[PDB]
Amino acid sequence: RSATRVMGGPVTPRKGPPKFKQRQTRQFGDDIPGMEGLGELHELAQYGI
Amino acid sequence: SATRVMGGPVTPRKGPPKFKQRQTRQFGDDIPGMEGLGELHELAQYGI
Amino acid sequence: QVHRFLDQNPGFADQYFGRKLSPEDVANACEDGCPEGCTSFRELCQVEESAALFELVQDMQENVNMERVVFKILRRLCSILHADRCSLFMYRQRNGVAELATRLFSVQPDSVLEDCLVPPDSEIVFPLDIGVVGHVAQTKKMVNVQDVMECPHFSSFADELTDYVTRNILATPIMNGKDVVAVIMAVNKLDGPCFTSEDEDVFLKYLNFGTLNLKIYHLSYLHNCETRRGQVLLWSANKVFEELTDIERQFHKAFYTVRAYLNCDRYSVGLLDMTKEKEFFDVWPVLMGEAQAYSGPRTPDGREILFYKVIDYILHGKEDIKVIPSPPADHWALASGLPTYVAESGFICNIMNAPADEMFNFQEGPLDDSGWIVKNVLSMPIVNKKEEIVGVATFYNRKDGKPFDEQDEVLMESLTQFLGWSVLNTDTYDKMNKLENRKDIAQDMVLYHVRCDREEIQLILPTRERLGKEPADCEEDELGKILKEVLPGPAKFDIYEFHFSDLECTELELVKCGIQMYYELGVVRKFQIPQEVLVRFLFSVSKGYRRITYHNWRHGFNVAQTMFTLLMTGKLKSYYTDLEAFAMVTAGLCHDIDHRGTNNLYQMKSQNPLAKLHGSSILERHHLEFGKFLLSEETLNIYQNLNRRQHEHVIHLMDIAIIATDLALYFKKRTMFQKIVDESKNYEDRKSWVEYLSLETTRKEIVMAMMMTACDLSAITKPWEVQSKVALLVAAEFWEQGDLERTVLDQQPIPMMDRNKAAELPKLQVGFIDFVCTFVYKEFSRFHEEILPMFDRLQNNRKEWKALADEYEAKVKALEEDQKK
Amino acid sequence: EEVEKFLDSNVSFAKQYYNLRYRAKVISDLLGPREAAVDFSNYHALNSVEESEIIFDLLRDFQDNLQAEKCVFNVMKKLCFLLQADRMSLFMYRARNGIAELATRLFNVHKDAVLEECLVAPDSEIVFPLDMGVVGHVALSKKIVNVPNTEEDEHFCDFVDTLTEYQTKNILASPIMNGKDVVAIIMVVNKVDGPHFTENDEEILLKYLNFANLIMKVFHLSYLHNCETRRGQILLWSGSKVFEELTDIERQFHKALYTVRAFLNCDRYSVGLLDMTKQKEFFDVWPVLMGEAPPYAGPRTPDGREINFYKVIDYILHGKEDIKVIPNPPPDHWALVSGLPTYVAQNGLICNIMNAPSEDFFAFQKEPLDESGWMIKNVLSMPIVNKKEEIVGVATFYNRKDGKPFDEMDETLMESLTQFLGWSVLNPDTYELMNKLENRKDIFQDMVKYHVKCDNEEIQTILKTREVYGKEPWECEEEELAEILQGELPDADKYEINKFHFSDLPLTELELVKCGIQMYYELKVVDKFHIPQEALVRFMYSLSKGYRRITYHNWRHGFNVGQTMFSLLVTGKLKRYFTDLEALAMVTAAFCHDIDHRGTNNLYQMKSQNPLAKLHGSSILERHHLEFGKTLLRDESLNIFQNLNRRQHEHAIHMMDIAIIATDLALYFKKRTMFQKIVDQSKTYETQQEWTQYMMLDQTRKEIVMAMMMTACDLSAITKPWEVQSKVALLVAAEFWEQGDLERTVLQQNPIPMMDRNKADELPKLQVGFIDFVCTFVYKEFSRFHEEITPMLDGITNNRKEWKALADEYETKMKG
Ligand SMILES: Nc1nc2c(ncn2[C@@H]2O[C@@H]3COP(=O)(O)O[C@H]3[C@H]2O)c(=O)[nH]1
Ligand SMILES: Nc1nc2c(ncn2[C@@H]2O[C@@H]3COP(=O)(O)O[C@H]3[C@H]2O)c(=O)[nH]1
Ligand SMILES: [Mg+2]
Ligand SMILES: [Mg+2]
Ligand SMILES: [Zn+2]
Secondary structure, rough: OOOOOOOOOOOOOOOOOOOEEEEOOOOOOOOOOHHOOOOHHHHHOOOOO | OHHHOOOOOOOOOOOOOEEEEEEOOOOOOOOOHHHHHOOOHHHHHHOO | HHHHHHOOOOHHHHHHHHHOOOOOOOOOOOOOOOOOOOOOOHHHHHHHHHHHHHHHHHHHOOOHHHHHHHHHHHHHHHHHEEEEEEEEEEEEEEEEEEEEEEEEEEEOOOOOOOOOOOOOOHHHOOEOOOOHHHHHHHOOOOEEOOOOOOOOOOOHHHHHHHOOOOOOOEEEEEOOOEEEEEEEEEEEOOOOOOOOHHHHHHHHOOOOOOHHHHHHHHHHHHHHHHHHHHHHHOOOOOOOHOOOOHHHHHHHHHHHHHHHHHHHHEEEEEEEEOOOOOHHHHHHHHHHHHOOOOOOOOOOOEOOOEEEEEEOOOOOOOOOOOOOOOOOOOOHHHHHHHHHHHHHHOOOOEEEEEHHHOOOOOOOOOOOOOOOOOOEEEEEEHHHOOOEEEEEEEEEEOOOOOOOHHHHOOOHHHHHHHHOHHHHHHHHHHHHHHHHHHHHHHHHHHHHHHHOOOOOOOOOOOOOOOOOOOOOOOOOHHHHHHHHHHOOOOOOOOOOOOOOOOOOOOHHHHHHHHHHHHHOHHHHHEEEOOHHHHHHHHHHHHHHHHOOOOOHHHHHHHHHHHHHHHHHHOOOOOOOOOOHHHHHHHHOOOOOOOOOOOOOHHHHOOHHHHHHHOOOHHHHHHHHHHHHHHHHHHOOOOOOOOHHHHHHHHHHHHHHHHHHHOHHHHHHHHHHHHHHHHHHHHHOOHHHHHHHHHOOOOHHHHHHHHHHHHHHOOOOOOOOHHHHHHHHHHHHHHHHHHHHHHHHOOOOOOOOOOOOOOOHHHHHHHHHHHHHHHHHHHHHHHHHHHHHHHHHHHHHHHHHHHHHHHHHHHHHHHHOOOOOO | HHHHHHHOOOHHHHHHHHHHHHHHHHHHHOOOOOOOOOOOOOOOOOOOOHHHHHHHHHHHOOOOOOHHHHHHHHHHHHHHHOOOOOOOOEEEEEEOOOOOOEEEEEEEOOOOHHHHEEEEEOOOOOOEOOOOOHHHHHHHHHEEEOOOOOOOOOHHHHHHHHHHHHOOEEEEEEEEEEEOOEEEEEEEEEEOOOOOOOOOHHHHHHHHHHHHHHHHHHHHHHHHHHHHHHHHHHHHHHHHHOOOOOOHHHHHHHHHHOOOOOOOOOOOEEEEEOEEEEOOOHHHHHHOOOOOOOOOOOEEEEOOOEEEEEEEEEEEOOOOOOOOEEEOOOOOOOOOOOOOHHHHHOEEEEEEEEEEHHOOOOOOOOOOOOOOOOOOOOOEEEOOOOOOOOOOOOEEEEEOOOOOOOOOOHHHHHHHHHHHHHHHOOHHHHHHHHHHHHHHHHHHHHHHHHHHHOOOOOOOOOOOOOOOOOOOOOOOOOOHHHHHHHHHOOOOEEEEEEEOOOOOOOOOOOOOOOOHHHHHHHHOOHHOOOOOHHHHHHHHHHHHOOOOOOOOOHHHHHHHHHHHHHHHHEEEEHHHHHHHHHHHHHHHHHOOOOOOOOOHHHHHHHHHHOOHHHHHHHHHHHHHHHHHHOOOOOOOOOOOOOOOOHHHHHHHHHHHHHHHOOOOOHHHHOOOOHHHHHHHHHHHOOHHHHHHHHHHOOOHHHHHHHHHEEEEEEEEHHOOOOHHHHHHHHHHHHHHHHHHHHHHHHHOOOOOHHHHHOOOHHHHHHHHHHHOOOOOOHHHHHHHHHHHHHHHHHHHHHHHHHHHHHHHHHHHOOOO
């Protein structure tokens, strides 16, 4: 027999509505530095080349 | 210093370096269950 | 017998104990001369305690078992502190709330581990503020309640539940890096009214060994949990990035691959519908009263909760993973109602002792034939980057029998969060599928609007009249006879001459001339080209060309006709095989297919999708792609009776041919052609040069590219009566493009494109001739003497344009001097 | 005083009383700060009192603020006293590139030493391989080793002896274990008084290593837990940025590698991105093959492509965060000058470098790279694998923050990071695939838009502006276009445009286009909404061209449906319930109801898995028609809704969406009891005015009524007079026979008798069944709804009667 005189359930001394956790939304984009940098001819220009 | 070495870590044997092999061994439909994951008679008689 | 007298005379007791004890001892005592360590038994007590703690250290060192070591420490501390019993309270964090659960209870100096260990189903889970132990955990300090009746923190729950009376309480929290590992507690001081300050000091100092043991146990557990979290994250990332799939396949792969690291008897994943809005024919029954509105639970996004597919992972015993499409509300996972609540609220639900819960109708007992009873539940909402719940993952019955603590909560939360972000992969996959289907539909529409229909082919292949059969039914000999009696002869139109003019022939006559050009090369027979396919392909090419001023079907036959003359009248077919000439004339036909009337520069400046898809040689690559796609159609695939090597060579040779028509590309590689031409003069006779060049591959590619760029500009080398008219159409097209630039882009066009500078056309044509065409045609005349007429005509046209430009300049000068000066 | 005799008579009571009253005080004093009272200046045999004192002193260091090095050094001092030892040392077990190493952490520890003179900095450690030395032999054997004479040993190395000017004679060593991994090695160097270390000293070492074992276990577990936590945080944080959006490889890599900059614990690290161009275009390979330019000479990836770091991102973290991007970095760059990234790209091997300036393989900088004296000391460079085993980049991590050289845990952490990054290339590649596919779809959509749009030379066939005014249609004024259209457009009365018996047989397609334009002109929706008349004509001609030239579902069917809708609005007086905008949208939907019909019903599209079937789910062809019509209306030269308000435009688009989609028979079959309920509600009202007033306000009933009108117009061919129905039914049968032949050929499935070309003589029976099943309900309900739609019911009744006569004649012929 268990030393705590209880079987079949983790009995709790708290009587009340259960409460549940909040989803973690701690974020666990261009503000990063360096983001900006990541992504004889005249006749040719005359004739659309 | 205790080890009488001031500059840097010193090894007895000095040869060419040995380097790691890139890890590849550890890393479809083989998983079970993926096969399943992805008045009326005249209605069919007239195309519907 | 005299104990009270010893109490009333502390000085006598101190003097008697401080006496040097004789070497004679009582029992063993490890007497290495230890009777007189400043006291009668201080030496003996020191030796015995050192031996006991050394044995405890030995137990700690190998096969770490925190329960046994802590039990032995508590058993010794019961005797040392004179407490009636000691206890240990494990610290766990569920749902973000700290809880203290028993792990060692009613430990006595004459007890055993089996009679003091607390199984997971017999835990007195005290919350953080419902007892003195909770106050100890919250304050993170020792609490010594001399009398517990007046303690504002004492809870009589445990002592009533265990048929016990507590009078004095001493407890401390086992500390590790500002994280409360556990709370030791000693109650019911057996000898004194309460626990003295000396007992408090002993409680602090003697518990450092237990502190170290619990620190080791907690560190091992945390390290194992973090290793499992890393492994599950890595394995989920590997399967997610394996390919692009839907929600179901990706989630199934990720969840099944990591089943070993979850340590759960069972877990199920439910998938929610994403239909934000119902279509009109589904909203009609509700509005018209034919059906009732849905008054059931809704997601925080105002969405119907409907698990359309639940994947069940049953791992206890036999692995029998199941997929339940449209699961009923009677499903064992959904019957509890927890997934529905998780969908409604988007909370993290951690349930301890599920059968004893009241809010959720967890099943009474055995679920399956194996009698597996739901005991501990952890349910997680799978939420994408847009804060929308895609599904609910629920885990059951942790394999070790303990409830889901904070570490398992964070372990599964990391997995669910990673998979929720992975929904972007599924959204991108489905958008890939949608875009591919839309592009295929557009391609089919283009193919219908470009491919020559059943009725249009009868204009060149009359078979419903001559033979009464559709072209697909007539044999090759019949269609050959029909084409011979229908197609124009080589002398009807001078397709073999450099002075060919299309201004006196209809478009249908041009297509017939193209078929005749194909027949002249003799490629129909040796390659077994289906004649109906040839006619259909040529008509489809004619239709594919737009109806614009210059770059229409006529320019594209004149490009291919010139190449036919070059091959057969310029005698440049000596270096090229029949297959190469076939694939090279076809590329001449698809030279400027679907040209939009604007040059390559306009595509970049107007930011057309063409400019984004290609980047360099935009329109040339577009023409190549359209021609190859049109050829890919079976009914227009002239390259269908060809070997795989032959077809590959044909397509490859087409890529150089079509792309080299770009004037910018020609300007960067014409010196190589000049060097190749210079090699011809090194050789003695034409025969030796033919033998050498016909075997070279790169040099033939260069020559073919230059033949492309010469055929493109061949309109200039036409007789003046034709060039004068063609230049007007070219100028009109460029003027239209300049007007488009001025209107849409608000940019001033270059003088060649400016409609206002129409009188400068002769000078611009002279400059164009001097800059571009002169090199190509002079080098070709030097290369082959048969192409000399194409150069003399160029010089004559240049002379005429120079005369016109000089006339315009004289008029301008005369206007300038005679009035303005 | 007589009691004093009693405790002497029975000293067990005295022992028990001392335990009850003074044991707690003794334990408190022993576990207090205190100090060991053992005489450390002599070599006497350890008494049990002194042994207990030593044990308690070792236990005194078991505090919460566990300084592993200090506690282990105290244990070593006590062991030096106990073991008759001269000096002792510790070798941490570090795992570099596969080869485990043993570096000195505590050295020259004696009985009168301090932590300052025994602690070894990472720049003073003596790294020892597993192969050489008694230390290496102990590490490999994983067992205590006693060497009674160094001279006769086969593993002893004089390297440390020469480097420290010390002579070692007798060696005793033992490894410290955590599970089965060797953590550290405690070794002794000399027996002060004795030939060697006896078995008693071996037992003492084993007895007293338990405290050291526990301390080292705590230290190792803490370090491993911290490393695994950092790995998990790195993976999750990097996944967050990877799944933030779909971008190219550079942006994704920068986000991932900058978000986790704190977790890497590196003073500096740089990532170089390799070019992915496997095969160079023909115009680029020409000069190399022709001798104009020399071919590529040296560094080549295992994939066979040239090593060319086209962009290097270097993250400087030791001082001011100096995240920098170097497009086309020169070889002089501090990251690439060493040649380690080039070698890694050549091989694809994880390289851990300790004491980089001392290395000779790579030319590491031996001068301060920064103004603060920063030195490259420990380097770790790894590839970015990629799913095709194609090295796409090289990540190099420089000096660690704590100063220790990179070990197996750091290798594992950075390897998990780089493996995740290499796996996270599917998203950058899919981004380019998305962009190219979307551009290609836009290109082909522009092509289809041109091929169906009425060109400027075809609009002159109706809008004869060139031959009347000499100007192009876009130049002429609105009044001029109105006058031209009035001159050209037909008369509604003469052509029976607003009659239920309209026949398109004697009319040309251009005539039907002009009639359709006249339909818009009759509703008076042109002036009210200021519809550009040129755009109206061009859009009608575009609708005419867009319909395919198939047997039945050609543009004549679309014009017939539009005419039926117009007659229902005007002749049927159903425009009472609808506004002018709704009438315009409904007529436009009727004209676009079957645009670009392929000639095969929805079932064939689903069976053949046509891209239409994969794109649209429920109403494949109808949704395709709606999409194509809305795309046609989106063109500026074809948008007749350009002058509408935003609310008006949205209402019209919604109304068209309802109308076109409802044309399918499947939706009509399910939602047809609603029409009966609406008709009954109509008959409930007393006067038509009240019912009309109720209808113009309610929207759902209006939508259902129009949905039924769409199906009434789509089947209007049956309600036509017999001389028209007799030919239209044959055309419909011909198209369905063509679809059946296509099914039999491609899908290899037997067609239904309706679509079976062989059962051509059963057409009257199938038409009678069709009339009895689908159309009769619609037309009877509409005739009950409005008595003006009665001629439709009369026509369908007459057609059914004649089809029944034909079917009865056929059945009588089959008798025999
Ligand atoms: N039977 C028994 N009860 C204990 C023991 N230790 C603590 N408790 C009880 O458990 C309870 C937990 O909340 P409290 O600290 O307020 O009071 C405590 C005591 O009443 C123990 O060793 N044996
Ligand atoms: N002077 C000195 N040498 C040591 C010490 N510890 C180990 N060594 C030496 O370092 C050497 C490493 O290789 P070996 O084990 O063969 O032999 C060892 C010893 O000779 C120490 O504490 N002091
Ligand atoms: Mg071109
Ligand atoms: Mg339809
Ligand atoms: Zn229709």
